[PDB]
Amino acid sequence: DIQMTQSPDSLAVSLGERATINCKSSQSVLSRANNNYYVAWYQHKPGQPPKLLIYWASTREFGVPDRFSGSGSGTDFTLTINSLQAEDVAVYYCQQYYTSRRTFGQGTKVEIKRTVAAPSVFIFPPSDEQLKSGTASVVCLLNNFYPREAKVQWKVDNALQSGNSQESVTEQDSKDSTYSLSSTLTLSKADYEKHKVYACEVTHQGLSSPVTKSFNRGE
Amino acid sequence: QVQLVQSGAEVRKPGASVKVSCKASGYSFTDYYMHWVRQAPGQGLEWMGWINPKSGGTNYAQRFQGRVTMTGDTSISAAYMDLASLTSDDTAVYYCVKDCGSGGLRDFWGQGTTVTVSSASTKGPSVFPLAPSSGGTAALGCLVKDYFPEPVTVSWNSGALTSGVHTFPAVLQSSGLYSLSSVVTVPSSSLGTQTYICNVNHKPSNTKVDKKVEPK
Ligand SMILES: O=S(=O)(O)C[C@@H](O)CNC1CCCCC1
């Protein structure tokens, strides 16, 4: 089958600057009959199905802004976004349709590159309502930071926790180009009521040193 | 111009099969190709196969050969994707895609059908407060814990409060149940005057909860 290898995986580009996304076919995708490359580019955003931008490597689909362009040269395909706008934040995929079986590339996530912004950190103890149930969730919020890379370290009575937390991250905010992240530490009610000091320690390149938010159980 | 209407979300146990439908209207009903594309959590788009609903001809990706069957009913402009021997690797959104002729737009997509492969039973969430406890601004929220299947929606003050709201992607817990957090930042001065209610809806369990969140 024909493989499509995209690069890079992730691209950060300043507003109004040029984004370049690459895709390499494992074999020719050129028709000798019409000299067209059988390559498409798709844009995938939340709340909408994938959207065709470019077909036959370089033909823009109706309704696609002229800042999108495609190029094909043998096995190398490029999608260029000139004058990147916040609305262009998406995952982009190449696709070959040279063969009867089609192949997507793995995708490239495009974000707006803004200046580094440190997170604002907040910690929430488990509710008394939840404690009735035999589980405790401790929540740490990292608000409005850039870039997305951040380390959350939970500590309980200064013991570093590993494997008992989960986190998830918002899509980039369209107005300020930041991320937010929530981490949840799950522990038994018995363990929660045994220990005292609950801390969320945040490492981020916008901070000089890690920031800790903490509470003492019962205060 | 063209609508591809897909069947509703499905839950299946591992080893079961699922059949998803796609019904076209607006342009043609016979000689076009319908494709199926899926997206599993954290993964890229994956092309599954095509069917020509006029001829009934099909072609499947090698990794689904022997496990997928696509069929068509040209009389109701319908295409079906039947996937057998389901595992958690088949939890995904499944999209139908029409291949158009020359003249206009080259393709049209359905909105997707979510299939969840799990042994978990339908369960409505518990909703716990994240009570406000930082430089003129306070954070508060709702923890929406232990529900199945996806999705849940959260609004604030019946959708009147949008500024500073962040609703995180759900996480799947080792229990097989999902958890989601929604937060909002507000002026600290507002915590005395203004009420904050998170509106949680889990349609799969017919569970709607309004939780008022206040300082402890
Ligand atoms: O109105 S919406 O359907 O958007 C969300 C709905 O759950 C709100 N219910 C109200 C909450 C305040 C007290 C009266 C009941």
Residue numbers in the entry:
A (entry chain LLL): 1 to 219
B (entry chain HHH): 1 to 133, 138 to 220
How do the authors describe this structure?
Wall teichoic acids (WTAs) are glycopolymers decorating the surface of Gram-positive bacteria and potential targets for antibody-mediated treatments against Staphylococcus aureus, including methicillin-resistant (MRSA) strains. By using an integrated approach that combines microarray, synthetic chemistry, X-ray crystallography, NMR spectroscopy, and computational studies, we showed that S. aureus WTA glycoforms bind the mAbs 4461 and 4497 in a cavity formed between the CDRs of the heavy and light chains. The GlcNAc moiety is a prime recognition element, being inserted in the antibody binding pocket, and the RboP residue to which the GlcNAc is appended and both phosphates interacted with the antibody surface participating in the binding.
Specifically, we revealed that the (α-1,4)-GlcNAc specific mAb 4461 displayed an “end-on” insertion binding mode with the antigen-binding-site amino acids forming numerous contacts with the α-GlcNAc residue and interactions with the RboP backbone. The crystal structure revealed the amino acid residues of both the light and heavy chains involved in binding WTA trimer 1. The carbonyl group of the light-chain residue Y98 was involved in a H-bond with the amide of the GlcNAc at 2.9 Å and with the Rbo-B hydroxyl group 3 at 2.6 Å, while its hydroxyl group made a H-bond with an oxygen atom (not involved in the phosphodiester linkage) of phosphate 1 at 2.8 Å. The carbonyl group of Y97 established two H-bonds, with the GlcNAc C3 hydroxyl group at 2.7 Å and with the GlcNAc acetamide at 3.5 Å. The heavy-chain residue Y33 interacted with the WTA ligand through the hydroxyl group, which could establish a H-bond with the GlcNAc C6-OH at 3.6 Å. Finally, residue S31 established a H-bond with an oxygen of phosphate 1 at 2.8 Å. This provides an explanation for the observation with the TA microarray that this mAb binds more strongly to internal GlcAc residues, being flanked by two phosphates, than to GlcNAc appendages of a terminal RboP moiety, having only one neighboring phosphate. The interactions revealed by the crystallographic structure also provided insight into why the α-GlcNAc attached to the GroP backbone is not recognized by the antibody.
